[PDB]
Design an enzyme around this catalytic site. Structure first.
Site, PDB file in Angstrom:
ATOM      1  N   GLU A  12       0.869  -1.163   0.000  1.00  0.00           N
ATOM      2  CA  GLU A  12       0.000   0.000   0.000  1.00  0.00           C
ATOM      3  C   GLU A  12       0.910   1.217   0.000  1.00  0.00           C
ATOM      4  O   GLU A  12       1.067   1.900   1.009  1.00  0.00           O
ATOM      5  CB  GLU A  12      -0.900  -0.048   1.234  1.00  0.00           C
ATOM      6  CG  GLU A  12      -1.696  -1.346   1.294  1.00  0.00           C
ATOM      7  CD  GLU A  12      -2.578  -1.464   2.519  1.00  0.00           C
ATOM      8  OE1 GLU A  12      -2.045  -1.407   3.652  1.00  0.00           O
ATOM      9  OE2 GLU A  12      -3.805  -1.624   2.344  1.00  0.00           O
ATOM     10  N   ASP A  82      11.807  -6.473  -3.174  1.00  0.00           N
ATOM     11  CA  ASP A  82      12.306  -5.131  -2.914  1.00  0.00           C
ATOM     12  C   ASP A  82      13.513  -5.245  -2.010  1.00  0.00           C
ATOM     13  O   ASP A  82      13.779  -6.308  -1.437  1.00  0.00           O
ATOM     14  CB  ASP A  82      11.246  -4.175  -2.318  1.00  0.00           C
ATOM     15  CG  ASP A  82      10.690  -4.632  -0.975  1.00  0.00           C
ATOM     16  OD1 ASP A  82      11.461  -4.927  -0.049  1.00  0.00           O
ATOM     17  OD2 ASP A  82       9.454  -4.667  -0.857  1.00  0.00           O
ATOM     18  N   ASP A 123      11.658  10.278  -2.765  1.00  0.00           N
ATOM     19  CA  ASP A 123      11.300   9.403  -1.656  1.00  0.00           C
ATOM     20  C   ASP A 123      11.959   8.035  -1.744  1.00  0.00           C
ATOM     21  O   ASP A 123      11.304   6.994  -1.609  1.00  0.00           O
ATOM     22  CB  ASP A 123       9.774   9.282  -1.584  1.00  0.00           C
ATOM     23  CG  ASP A 123       9.290   8.691  -0.260  1.00  0.00           C
ATOM     24  OD1 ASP A 123      10.005   8.802   0.770  1.00  0.00           O
ATOM     25  OD2 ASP A 123       8.179   8.120  -0.254  1.00  0.00           O
ATOM     26  N   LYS A 125      13.738   4.767  -0.637  1.00  0.00           N
ATOM     27  CA  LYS A 125      13.771   3.954   0.575  1.00  0.00           C
ATOM     28  C   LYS A 125      13.862   2.529   0.063  1.00  0.00           C
ATOM     29  O   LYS A 125      13.538   2.257  -1.102  1.00  0.00           O
ATOM     30  CB  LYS A 125      12.524   4.169   1.437  1.00  0.00           C
ATOM     31  CG  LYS A 125      11.237   4.047   0.709  1.00  0.00           C
ATOM     32  CD  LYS A 125      10.113   4.675   1.545  1.00  0.00           C
ATOM     33  CE  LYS A 125       8.811   4.589   0.806  1.00  0.00           C
ATOM     34  NZ  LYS A 125       7.724   5.200   1.605  1.00  0.00           N
ATOM     35  N   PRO A 126      14.331   1.606   0.905  1.00  0.00           N
ATOM     36  CA  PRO A 126      14.485   0.194   0.547  1.00  0.00           C
ATOM     37  C   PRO A 126      13.259  -0.403  -0.132  1.00  0.00           C
ATOM     38  O   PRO A 126      13.387  -1.195  -1.046  1.00  0.00           O
ATOM     39  CB  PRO A 126      14.795  -0.469   1.886  1.00  0.00           C
ATOM     40  CG  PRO A 126      15.600   0.610   2.593  1.00  0.00           C
ATOM     41  CD  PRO A 126      14.780   1.852   2.294  1.00  0.00           C
ATOM     42  N   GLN A 127      12.072  -0.006   0.308  1.00  0.00           N
ATOM     43  CA  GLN A 127      10.836  -0.533  -0.278  1.00  0.00           C
ATOM     44  C   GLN A 127      10.597  -0.136  -1.716  1.00  0.00           C
ATOM     45  O   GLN A 127       9.850  -0.827  -2.418  1.00  0.00           O
ATOM     46  CB  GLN A 127       9.620  -0.096   0.531  1.00  0.00           C
ATOM     47  CG  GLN A 127       9.527  -0.796   1.847  1.00  0.00           C
ATOM     48  CD  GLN A 127       8.617  -0.055   2.789  1.00  0.00           C
ATOM     49  OE1 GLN A 127       9.008   0.961   3.384  1.00  0.00           O
ATOM     50  NE2 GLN A 127       7.379  -0.540   2.914  1.00  0.00           N
TER      51      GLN A 127
HETATM   52  N1  LIG Z   1       7.135   0.337  -3.573  1.00  0.00           N
HETATM   53  C1  LIG Z   1       6.515   0.463  -4.693  1.00  0.00           C
HETATM   54  C2  LIG Z   1       5.441   1.379  -4.796  1.00  0.00           C
HETATM   55  C3  LIG Z   1       4.747   1.523  -6.028  1.00  0.00           C
HETATM   56  C4  LIG Z   1       5.118   0.753  -7.163  1.00  0.00           C
HETATM   57  C5  LIG Z   1       6.194  -0.179  -7.088  1.00  0.00           C
HETATM   58  C6  LIG Z   1       6.534  -0.935  -8.225  1.00  0.00           C
HETATM   59  O1  LIG Z   1       6.580  -0.368  -9.320  1.00  0.00           O
HETATM   60  C7  LIG Z   1       6.809  -2.316  -8.157  1.00  0.00           C
HETATM   61  S1  LIG Z   1       6.631  -3.341  -6.766  1.00  0.00           S
HETATM   62  C8  LIG Z   1       7.179  -4.711  -7.657  1.00  0.00           C
HETATM   63  N2  LIG Z   1       7.291  -5.932  -7.180  1.00  0.00           N
HETATM   64  C9  LIG Z   1       7.522  -6.330  -5.959  1.00  0.00           C
HETATM   65  C10 LIG Z   1       7.731  -5.447  -4.848  1.00  0.00           C
HETATM   66  C11 LIG Z   1       7.987  -5.971  -3.561  1.00  0.00           C
HETATM   67  C12 LIG Z   1       8.037  -7.375  -3.371  1.00  0.00           C
HETATM   68  S2  LIG Z   1       8.382  -8.029  -1.771  1.00  0.00           S
HETATM   69  N3  LIG Z   1       7.751  -7.000  -0.589  1.00  0.00           N
HETATM   70  O2  LIG Z   1       9.822  -8.072  -1.652  1.00  0.00           O
HETATM   71  O3  LIG Z   1       7.833  -9.375  -1.641  1.00  0.00           O
HETATM   72  C13 LIG Z   1       7.828  -8.258  -4.458  1.00  0.00           C
HETATM   73  C14 LIG Z   1       7.576  -7.744  -5.733  1.00  0.00           C
HETATM   74  N4  LIG Z   1       7.483  -4.463  -8.908  1.00  0.00           N
HETATM   75  C15 LIG Z   1       7.277  -3.108  -9.205  1.00  0.00           C
HETATM   76  N5  LIG Z   1       7.507  -2.641 -10.366  1.00  0.00           N
HETATM   77  C16 LIG Z   1       6.898  -0.319  -5.836  1.00  0.00           C
END
Ligand SMILES: Nc1cccc(C(=O)c2sc(Nc3ccc(S(N)(=O)=O)cc3)nc2N)c1
Length: 294
Positions: A12, A82, A123, A125-127
């Site tokens: 989110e 991420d 912004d 950040k690791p996320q």
């Molecule tokens: N933070 C954020 C906000 C808005 C858009 C995006 C984004 O473009 C993402 S997010 C993702 N995959 C993914 C992300 C996290 C994980 S996790 N928690 O490591 O399991 C797994 C797959 N892929 C893309 N392209 C990222």
């Protein structure tokens, strides 16, 4: 919506919700961000177009932008993990230095690219740093503070992380420079190295004071003009700068030198992404493959 089958909610984010989704037609798997409404900016929807053409190997590709039914959808290429998750998964042993160095190097290339195109992330950040099995890392979720600004939270009651916020933002500067991204990346670099957040503030003032406690309360000597900034108070406590060697043990001197330059208080003295790429720290950079558990 309709053309996509939500596979799972990824998170989110700041402006909205992010889902892993499959294009019901092409079968392509993507990341779908749903944005939070009766106006919709123009400077924004066009700040988006600039991002669509902003294509680089260390920047998550924005595939499509769909504005319909009072909702805004951003379709991005999907990455599997991420950096926050990768760091947690590597907390016992730590991310090997060669991979830390490779990630930092790639992220600086990404920043050098957006900054040269006058695009700021705002912004980091690791996320919002995404990695794949091939050893790449990419910048995701660019902020449009020059479109949606930055309200009290993200979009629906959620604690915004201030850990990576540059001091000039915390002090009330109205106009951010590319330097804010260097600061955030320096904080992330430190965190990968030590396996602990560098400045884990839980409020703006606590964030600011944790920075001051470590780097020293800034003054006109190291940051000309700091005392005339919007939120600067003469009443700020005066903390001495801590020995840098206690900040990121056991990072080598090249790494500490580079970090110190990424964390300069004065936005104008803070190293640029381009100059950082030429730092001695990267003389032996390579591109290792991470061990990813998906
Ligand atoms: N933070 C954020 C906000 C808005 C858009 C995006 C984004 O473009 C993402 S997010 C993702 N995959 C993914 C992300 C996290 C994980 S996790 N928690 O490591 O399991 C797994 C797959 N892929 C893309 N392209 C990222």
């Amino acid at each position: 919506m309709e053309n996509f089958q939500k596979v799972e909610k990824i998170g989110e984010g700041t402006y909205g919700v992010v889902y892993k989704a499959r294009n019901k037609l092409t079968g392509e798997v993507v990341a779908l961000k749903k944005i939070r409404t009766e106006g919709v900016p123009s400077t924004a929807i066009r700040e988006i177009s600039l991002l669509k053409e902003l294509n680089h190997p260390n920047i998550v590709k924005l595939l499509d932008v769909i504005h319909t039914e009072n909702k805004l959808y951003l379709v991005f290429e999907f990455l599997h993990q991420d950096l926050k998750k990768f760091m947690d998964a590597s907390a016992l042993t730590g991310i090997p230095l060669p991979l830390i160095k490779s990630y930092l190097f790639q992220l600086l290339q990404g920043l050098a690219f957006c900054h040269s195109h006058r695009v700021l992330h705002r912004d980091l950040k690791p996320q919002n740093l995404l990695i794949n099995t091939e050893g790449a890392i990419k910048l995701a979720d660019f902020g449009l503070a020059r479109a949606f600004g930055v309200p009290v939270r993200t979009y629906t009651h959620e604690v915004v992380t201030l850990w990576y916020r540059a001091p000039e933002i915390l002090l009330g500067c109205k106009y951010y420079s590319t330097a804010v991204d260097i600061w955030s990346l320096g904080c992330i670099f430190a965190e990968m190295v030590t396996r602990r957040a560098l400045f884990p503030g839980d409020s703006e003032i606590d964030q600011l004071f944790r920075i001051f406690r470590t780097l020293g309360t800034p003054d006109e000597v190291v940051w000309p003009g700091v005392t005339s900034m919007p939120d600067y108070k003469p009443s700020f406590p005066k903390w001495a700068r801590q020995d840098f060697s206690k900040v990121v043990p056991p990072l080598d001197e090249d790494g500490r030198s580079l970090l110190s330059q990424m964390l300069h208080y004065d936005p104008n003295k803070r190293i640029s992404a381009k100059a950082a790429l030429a730092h001695p720290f990267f003389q032996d950079v390579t591109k290792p493959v991470p061990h990813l558990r998906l």
